Design a protein around this ligand. Structure first.
Ligand SMILES: CC1=C(/C=C/C(C)=C/C=C\C(C)=C\C=O)C(C)(C)CCC1
Length: 284
């Protein structure tokens, strides 16, 4: 506690320093500034290739994909698995595995086509971190039309925005936090949701990307959100479930976690209605 939303560095821009006591926070996930980081990455690659030297298909796939990756890359996986090399490696396995199970989201990807979606505002990204230093990602389902923008395109956007934002060590340590504006959620939309797609999302969220998803928030959901929650509820591991938060309209427990002050009008905040063009530009 005793940490203001401001205390944390900029979203988007590669980190510059470790101040703002976040470095200590990481140390509290068993991090050591002194001798660990350097070796861990080594150990991982030593493990990556070792397990690929067995001839096993996956461990090999990994070895190929990561054959040309800076040390900061591998650190992303170390940081996310609490500095457990083994666990860290497993995240790398599942990480590659995801791309394999889901070709469409990474194969014909066009840097141009993606920008279109991100400018469209799906998803959104708060230009600011919450009081914890977490990238607050946004989605506003109101007026969404699945025929115009595919649930896939929206996920591909997530993937890009993750690959990018994860270049920032601050983000790596504070994690993410998603806001879900289900105010415009229609029954026509609820039934238009492929369970196959929902798993795709869930998968992204679980043991796929080297991120710390700390909280999912839902707001203004209809009385039938329970129907859609119960469909996904089986997929979510305990850790993630305990992090899903449905506030309804009583934000007297919501605004403590997320400061109304940094939120666009779209999500009950003071700021101007979310701008996709602004965000997208900073991306590229
Ligand atoms: C309830 C539940 C989910 C379902 C989200 C809804 C049903 C998705 C619909 C629109 C999309 C594209 C929004 C993207 O931000 C998750 C995320 C699987 C896991 C968290 C708990």
């Amino acid at each position: 506690e005793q940490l203001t939303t401001k205390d944390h560095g900029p979203v988007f821009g590669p980190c510059s320093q470790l101040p703002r006591h976040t470095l200590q926070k990481a140390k509290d996930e068993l991090n050591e500034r002194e001798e660990t980081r350097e070796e861990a990455v080594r150990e991982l690659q030593e493990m990556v290739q070792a397990q690929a030297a067995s001839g096993e298909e996956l461990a090999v796939a990994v070895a190929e994909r990561v054959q040309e990756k800076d040390s900061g890359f591998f650190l992303r996986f170390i940081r996310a698995r609490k500095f457990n090399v083994g666990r860290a490696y497993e995240l790398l396995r599942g990480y590659v595995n995801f791309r394999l199970q889901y070709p469409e989201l990474f194969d014909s990807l066009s840097p141009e086509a993606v920008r279109c979606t991100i400018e469209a505002g799906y998803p959104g990204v708060l230009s600011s971190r919450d009081k914890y230093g977490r990238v607050v990602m946004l989605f506003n389902i109101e007026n969404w039309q699945s025929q115009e923008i595919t649930f896939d395109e929206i996920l591909q956007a997530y993937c890009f925005i993750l690959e990018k934002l994860l270049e920032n060590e601050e983000t790596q340590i504070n994690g993410f936090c998603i806001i879900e504006n289900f105010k415009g959620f229609t029954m026509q939309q609820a039934a238009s949701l492929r369970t196959s797609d929902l798993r795709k999302m869930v998968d992204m969220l679980q043991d796929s990307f080297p991120a710390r998803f700390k909280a999912i928030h839902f707001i203004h959901q209809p009385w039938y959100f329970t129907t859609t929650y119960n469909v996904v509820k089986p997929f979510l591991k305990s850790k993630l479930l305990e992090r899903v938060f449905v506030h309804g309209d009583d934000l007297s427990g919501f605004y403590q976690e997320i400061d109304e002050n940094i939120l666009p009008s779209d999500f009950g905040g003071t700021l101007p209605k979310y701008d996709g063009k602004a965000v997208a530009e900073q991306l590229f």
